[PDB]
Amino acid sequence: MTHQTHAYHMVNPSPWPLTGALSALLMTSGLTMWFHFNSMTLLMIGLTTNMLTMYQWWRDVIRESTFQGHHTPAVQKGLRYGMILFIISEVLFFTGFFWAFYHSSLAPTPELGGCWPPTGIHPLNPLEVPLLNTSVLLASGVSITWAHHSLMEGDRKHMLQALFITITLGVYFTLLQASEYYEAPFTISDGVYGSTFFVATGFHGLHVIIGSTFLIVCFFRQLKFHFTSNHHFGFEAGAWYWHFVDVVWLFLYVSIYWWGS
Amino acid sequence: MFINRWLFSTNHKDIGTLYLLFGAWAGMVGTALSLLIRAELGQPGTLLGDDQIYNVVVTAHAFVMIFFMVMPIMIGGFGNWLVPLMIGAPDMAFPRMNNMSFWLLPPSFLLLLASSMVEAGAGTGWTVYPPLAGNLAHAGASVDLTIFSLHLAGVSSILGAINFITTIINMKPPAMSQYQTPLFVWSVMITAVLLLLSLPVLAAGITMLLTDRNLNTTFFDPAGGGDPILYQHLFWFFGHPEVYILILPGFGMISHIVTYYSGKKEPFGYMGMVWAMMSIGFLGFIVWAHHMFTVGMDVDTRAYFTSATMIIAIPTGVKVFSWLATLHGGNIKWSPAMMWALGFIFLFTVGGLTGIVLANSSLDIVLHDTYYVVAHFHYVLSMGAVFAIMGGFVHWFPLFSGYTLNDTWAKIHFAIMFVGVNMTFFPQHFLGLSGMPRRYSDYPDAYTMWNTISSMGSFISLTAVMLMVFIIWEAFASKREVLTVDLTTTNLEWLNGCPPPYHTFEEPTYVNLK
Amino acid sequence: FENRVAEKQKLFQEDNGLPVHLKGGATDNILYRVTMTLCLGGTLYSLYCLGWASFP
Amino acid sequence: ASGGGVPTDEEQATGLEREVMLAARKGQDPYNILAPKATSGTKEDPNLVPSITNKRIVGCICEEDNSTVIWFWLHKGEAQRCPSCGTHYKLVPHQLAH
Amino acid sequence: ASAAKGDHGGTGARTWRFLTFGLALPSVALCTLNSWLHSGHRERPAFIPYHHLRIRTKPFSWGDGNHTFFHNPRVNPLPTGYEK
Amino acid sequence: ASAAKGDHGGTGARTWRFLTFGLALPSVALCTLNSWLHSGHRERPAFIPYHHLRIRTKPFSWGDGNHTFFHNPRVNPLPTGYEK
Amino acid sequence: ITAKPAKTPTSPKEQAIGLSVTFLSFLLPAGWVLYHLDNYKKS
Amino acid sequence: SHYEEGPGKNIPFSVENKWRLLAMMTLFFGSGFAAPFFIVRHQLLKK
Amino acid sequence: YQTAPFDSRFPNQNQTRNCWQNYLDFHRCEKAMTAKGGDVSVCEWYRRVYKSLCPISWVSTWDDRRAEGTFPGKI
Amino acid sequence: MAYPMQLGFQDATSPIMEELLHFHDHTLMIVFLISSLVLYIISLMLTTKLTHTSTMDAQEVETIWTILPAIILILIALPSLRILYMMDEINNPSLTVKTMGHQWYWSYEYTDYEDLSFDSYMIPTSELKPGELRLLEVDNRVVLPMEMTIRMLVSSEDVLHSWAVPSLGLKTDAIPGRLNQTTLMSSRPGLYYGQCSEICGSNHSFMPIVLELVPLKYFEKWSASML
Numbered sequence A: 001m002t003h004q005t006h007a008y009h010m011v012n013p014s015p016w017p018l019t020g021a022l023s024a025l026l027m028t029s030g031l032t033m034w035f036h037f038n039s040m041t042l043l044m045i046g047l048t049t050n051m052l053t054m055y056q057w058w059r060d061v062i063r064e065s066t067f068q069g070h071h072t073p074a075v076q077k078g079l080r081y082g083m084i085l086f087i088i089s090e091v092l093f094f095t096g097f098f099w100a101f102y103h104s105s106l107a108p109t110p111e112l113g114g115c116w117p118p119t120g121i122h123p124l125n126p127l128e129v130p131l132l133n134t135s136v137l138l139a140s141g142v143s144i145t146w147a148h149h150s151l152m153e154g155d156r157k158h159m160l161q162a163l164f165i166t167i168t169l170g171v172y173f174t175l176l177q178a179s180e181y182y183e184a185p186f187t188i189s190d191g192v193y194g195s196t197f198f199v200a201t202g203f204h205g206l207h208v209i210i211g212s213t214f215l216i217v218c219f220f221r222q223l224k225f226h227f228t229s230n231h232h233f234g235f236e237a238g239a240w241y242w243h244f245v246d247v248v249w250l251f252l253y254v255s256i257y258w259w260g261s
Numbered sequence B: 001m002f003i004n005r006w007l008f009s010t011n012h013k014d015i016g017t018l019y020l021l022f023g024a025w026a027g028m029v030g031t032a033l034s035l036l037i038r039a040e041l042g043q044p045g046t047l048l049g050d051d052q053i054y055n056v057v058v059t060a061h062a063f064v065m066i067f068f069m070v071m072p073i074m075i076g077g078f079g080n081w082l083v084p085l086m087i088g089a090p091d092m093a094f095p096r097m098n099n100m101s102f103w104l105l106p107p108s109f110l111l112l113l114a115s116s117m118v119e120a121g122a123g124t125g126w127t128v129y130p131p132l133a134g135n136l137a138h139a140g141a142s143v144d145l146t147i148f149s150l151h152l153a154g155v156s157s158i159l160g161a162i163n164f165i166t167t168i169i170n171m172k173p174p175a176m177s178q179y180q181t182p183l184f185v186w187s188v189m190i191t192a193v194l195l196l197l198s199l200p201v202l203a204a205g206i207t208m209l210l211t212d213r214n215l216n217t218t219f220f221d222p223a224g225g226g227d228p229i230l231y232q233h234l235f236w237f238f239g240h241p242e243v244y245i246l247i248l249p250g251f252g253m254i255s256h257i258v259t260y261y262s263g264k265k266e267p268f269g270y271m272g273m274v275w276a277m278m279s280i281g282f283l284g285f286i287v288w289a290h291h292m293f294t295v296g297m298d299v300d301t302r303a304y305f306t307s308a309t310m311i312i313a314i315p316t317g318v319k320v321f322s323w324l325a326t327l328h329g330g331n332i333k334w335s336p337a338m339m340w341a342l343g344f345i346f347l348f349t350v351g352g353l354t355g356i357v358l359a360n361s362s363l364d365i366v367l368h369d370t371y372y373v374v375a376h377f378h379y380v381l382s383m384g385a386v387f388a389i390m391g392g393f394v395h396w397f398p399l400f401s402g403y404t405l406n407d408t409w410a411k412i413h414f415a416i417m418f419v420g421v422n423m424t425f426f427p428q429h430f431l432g433l434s435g436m437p438r439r440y441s442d443y444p445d446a447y448t449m450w451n452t453i454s455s456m457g458s459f460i461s462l463t464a465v466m467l468m469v470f471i472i473w474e475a476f477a478s479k480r481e482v483l484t485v486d487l488t489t490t491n492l493e494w495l496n497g498c499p500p501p502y503h504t505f506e507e508p509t510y511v512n513l514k
Numbered sequence C: 001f002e003n004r005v006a007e008k009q010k011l012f013q014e015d016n017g018l019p020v021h022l023k024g025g026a027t028d029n030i031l032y033r034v035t036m037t038l039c040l041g042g043t044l045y046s047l048y049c050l051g052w053a054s055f056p
Numbered sequence D: 001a002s003g004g005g006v007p008t009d010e011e012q013a014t015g016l017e018r019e020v021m022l023a024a025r026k027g028q029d030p031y032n033i034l035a036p037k038a039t040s041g042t043k044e045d046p047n048l049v050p051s052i053t054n055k056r057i058v059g060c061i062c063e064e065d066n067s068t069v070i071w072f073w074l075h076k077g078e079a080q081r082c083p084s085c086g087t088h089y090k091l092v093p094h095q096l097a098h
Numbered sequence E, F: 001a002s003a004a005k006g007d008h009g010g011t012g013a014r015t016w017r018f019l020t021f022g023l024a025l026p027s028v029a030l031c032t033l034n035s036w037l038h039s040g041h042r043e044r045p046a047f048i049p050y051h052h053l054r055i056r057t058k059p060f061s062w063g064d065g066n067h068t069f070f071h072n073p074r075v076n077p078l079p080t081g082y083e084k
Numbered sequence G: 001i002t003a004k005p006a007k008t009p010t011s012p013k014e015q016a017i018g019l020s021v022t023f024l025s026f027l028l029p030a031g032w033v034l035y036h037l038d039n040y041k042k043s
Numbered sequence H: 001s002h003y004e005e006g007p008g009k010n011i012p013f014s015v016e017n018k019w020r021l022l023a024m025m026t027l028f029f030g031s032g033f034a035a036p037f038f039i040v041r042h043q044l045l046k047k
Numbered sequence I: 001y002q003t004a005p006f007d008s009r010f011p012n013q014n015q016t017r018n019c020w021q022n023y024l025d026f027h028r029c030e031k032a033m034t035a036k037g038g039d040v041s042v043c044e045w046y047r048r049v050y051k052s053l054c055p056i057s058w059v060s061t062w063d064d065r066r067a068e069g070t071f072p073g074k075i
Numbered sequence J: 001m002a003y004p005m006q007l008g009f010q011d012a013t014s015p016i017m018e019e020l021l022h023f024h025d026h027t028l029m030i031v032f033l034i035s036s037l038v039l040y041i042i043s044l045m046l047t048t049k050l051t052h053t054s055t056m057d058a059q060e061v062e063t064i065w066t067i068l069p070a071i072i073l074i075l076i077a078l079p080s081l082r083i084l085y086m087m088d089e090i091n092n093p094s095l096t097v098k099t100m101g102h103q104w105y106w107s108y109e110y111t112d113y114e115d116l117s118f119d120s121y122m123i124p125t126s127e128l129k130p131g132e133l134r135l136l137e138v139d140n141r142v143v144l145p146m147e148m149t150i151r152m153l154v155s156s157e158d159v160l161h162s163w164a165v166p167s168l169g170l171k172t173d174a175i176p177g178r179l180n181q182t183t184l185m186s187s188r189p190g191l192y193y194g195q196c197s198e199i200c201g202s203n204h205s206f207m208p209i210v211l212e213l214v215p216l217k218y219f220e221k222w223s224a225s226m227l
Ligand code: HEA
Pocket: B243, B244, B246, B247, B290, B291, B293, B309, B310, B312, B313, B314, B316, B317, B318, B320, B348, B349, B350, B351, B352, B353, B355, B356, B358, B359, B360, B364, B367, B368, B369, B373, B376, B377, B380, B381, B384, B385, J034, J068, J069, J070, J072, J073
């Protein structure tokens, strides 16, 4: 009593949960304005307060762990579980989209021409840029691993070098994918093929951007000596998320880009 | 101060209280909606109007009771309040995130309220199936708002599911195995896993529905080659686990209540009980299609789903029989909570037995979309999930508040509600066997008797939920402070007195490693 | 490069009875108020829009 | 490869993290991260329950495979016994607390 | 289609840095060249007003409400036909 | 078709013994019953001297050199036709 | 479960008041809206 | 923590005056039960 | 001819393809007997079946699609 | 149709519906057995002053109560599945009618030979002739030949709808872009009512189904006078 004798973390009252909850309200209702009464001001404010919340909520977490030392071993083991579990819910999110795809491509309705890809659709070639995007993502898988190993071996320069290479490959994929979208001879509106394609590869795209800003954050935390050769969960997570991202692309490639086209 | 405590919390007890408050209020809205439903059906004719205004009411009834009363109360309320106390944890693994879970709820509720105001609301059914939910048959912001409300409520529940699993797994005393935690904790740890795996598929489904009606996609539109049935699969893949997610924490509370008032140390067959919930949770993931028997699927697959659905009776059976075995040599105390526990055991049995009937695709052909299925789920929800909530509420109220309830009044409240719900839902078995469809604002003259009796019962229930509010007031008005609690040796939640201090287990708990 | 986590550890461990989200200075405070302001205002604005859209 | 540059816990760990780090190397466990090992539990060899106050909740897993932990407050004073199996427990002042 | 190859039993950072520059990056270069060589610009596909394509049940929330987001006029026709 | 289920974070022998008798074995029992119920004895398939079947380029190293190893006369015809 | 006597007991009259009030607060608003249904259905 | 403890103090509403409480509970649960009625009314008065 | 008989390749509750297949089949046969003459022989069977099973609106729209050349099936 | 104060199923107009009544009786007999067993055990447990609060051995009795429910489930499953296949059985229909759900009316199409098609709408309770059923009468009944195997094909031209006729033990959803099939086979003449069994908008409750079954002879003359 008074002084605690358990290794856990009693976090100080934060206004951030309220702030982020309000943010969700603003973005959701804001999308409703954009979609219906053609307005984005509300959507803009929501995106704003949301970034503000994430910045601060994560800034504090850094403060509490790196500056204040609350991340004892027990606290860390809990963060590992949390991340795993989160990645899991994500894996099941993408599963709705592969279900959708397979459902459509395995039993093509007559309005499509009773075939797959539907008549009128000119699928991209898996052997062209899709093949490139694949090799880029896969390489960042090996380079992020090199980064992880340098970090554990206390090799500051190399961890930085590998983390940098990894980050640029992630960006390279983003640009490449962006151009593919623009050059694609089909759109979201091109029936079920376009729907199925643009939302699955699209949500994944959003995830590569989310994973890249995460690695960027890790980059700077390292420039500032935040990570020790032994305590760098922020990186472990960034790394786990990054792999989830290659893997999802492997399924996308094989399913949508290769098999279903 | 108030702000810091109530808006900026990181306390499992306070967040849990905030939930119970949200759930009770939402419970009022849902009750009002259920009364308009029976008001409309209590006399042949139309009171409100067309199946649109009526079905808007039926839809909000479902969303409110499922997502805003039952889930917040059982998982967020009792979950946050009791879990840490039962495993000897100082709090939860992610105190801050835990708060966001709660605060995501009021906005979510707003979006749902907003949906029924703009345009003509959402008269789609809680399943919000397309084409009816589409931008043609349901143009306007309504359905979109219904969808966004569901997104938030889902984000809220999987964030909390993440918290409970981490806490429950990672924050028990070092010498305590998982096979040493109480059934309630197991009950929410398992419910937490179902939420983690089912909720995302729903979000995948309704996001596809959202794009279909705002971004010109055709996931469920035949024109583009879509399939309205695809939505049914996605929805129901979540839709079934969802009902177990709704009864599991109830199973747990019941195990605690029956054992306590039987004067027993522990429940009969503890490991059988753990096995049972785990089986129930698992089989619950491979039976979704029993909700699609009249959709045009292959006879073979239709056969698979009726069988798979039926084996769930076995584990559920070991639980019913275990609670009975628990009462066995007990020194029974006829307390209000024990009354709720007994009702649950019977009523839930009847309602689940009635669900085995519907498990049969052949018979379900003529039973689907009728009031028989409305009877089935109200038995397991109105006198199953809800009875557990009441038993748990009256049993733990002193722990949460420090004050006691007037037991006699509390017993009167059971009597009234027991009569009310049975009178309301019993007749409905007939209306359904005899053909009265679901989601109708009016019915052929023949169905008049049962619909009348049914509606009268709903008024008795109204009386009971009014009395309860009073019962809570009186408790707080009189202020009889708790002194002594029985069987604390085997019930940790009570060891820190009523109410436990803001900070419990500041200095851990000592548990030997034999 | 630098490495001055040691200065910040000290700054944040300082017993000034401040909550972590403010323990870092004046900017923490302005950021806080800006965020809080935008959220509340936005929330007010949203309620207005809904009241407005509720009507034909 | 080759080189160096990243901090170590021994040199950069702070707060409670550091406290358990050091405490752990001295073989002691002030923040109860480990499971306390039982004594014979006889009146003469009671289990010694350290505490930072004058009472601590003791949970007794009477028999190895038991699913029910017996809970109770252990107070400062004479050795006390688990209500279900005797087994003596005696409170003791908690040393290291930083 | 491979099976595997040169085992180097001990993997540390030197090994991963070796794979990065000795395998990973060289592949990204080859494929880049490949994709830079197979850069055949396909002539915009023949327009035929199929009903299962160019779907429009609600005008898009932007522009003239008839233009998809990453609209490329060269290869994407409007429902009516190619842009210009 | 599942997703997963009841997590019990700590796995020791008790957990695996629990899965063995509480999951593994019960499944073997169900499927056993299933296969014991679907035990429909198919009537021996119609014989038609297809050339791509009952291949014989070298008599088998046993018996009359025309009988496959696990020969079941009820359902396996010789090249000429069913045994008897 | 034992408890100390009420610090501020609620006499029957007091209960009768709280019970009546609790009822009215539920029954009135609904009753009013329901009482005027036809007026709404006829504009 | 300057957070007060004990019966009647671990809640976000005052329980010190039974009648002020009566009022609050009445508005709280009351407004919740009335909402659906007024929404239906609102929908019935549109065109 | 009474009505389209049971078709083994379409043994389940869903007949969508049954309607679809025969509609194609007929028009595919028709086009051939035309571009071959072969005494302008005619594949009536398929038309009897597809007319029985396919709801009017589908046949209509398909015919129109075939008219403007936006019919997705390959004939 | 359904009469006042009815408890169970509408009388079976067809053989599978008869088959169902018997299966339900079987299934219901069991739910009565179990539900009364549980109630007896419960009252038994709560009726003695004798106590035994010490530990009790589980598992032993745990087999009885796990193997028993398992046997009972087979006793229901078997009959259920048989009827299930019996419904999706290889039959050869002598007629094919199509029905298309629409937002607030069904339309039928008899097109085996001639292109006969009409709309079936509910008769406003206001224009009902004495003796006519309030929310069940339709203006154009779907006429069909009694004692014959008909093949119904259900679909919709808009939202989802569900075509059902309880007396015949039929219910098939109407999904746009889909052709669901069902076998109708009444073994007796008459008027057989049903209703839309799927939420489809404002008048979901007001789009009934009325089957009128007469002998072939009268069926064909009706068919012709219909165009
Ligand atoms: C908490 C709520 C809850 C619970 C626990 C259940 C439990 C079950 N339900 Fe469900 N059900 C609902 C709520 C619930 N249900 C809802 C909301 C709907 C409608 C949704 C909608 O479409 O809108 C519905 C719909 C529904 C349908 C589809 C109806 C239709 O055609 O539309 C089916 C069919 O399989 C079904 C079956 C079952 C079964 C087999 C169980 C089993 O879990 C029952 C298990 C219990 C027992 C079996 C009794 C105890 C055990 C014994 C005493 C052992 C001995 C007994 C035997 C051997 C039989 N339910």
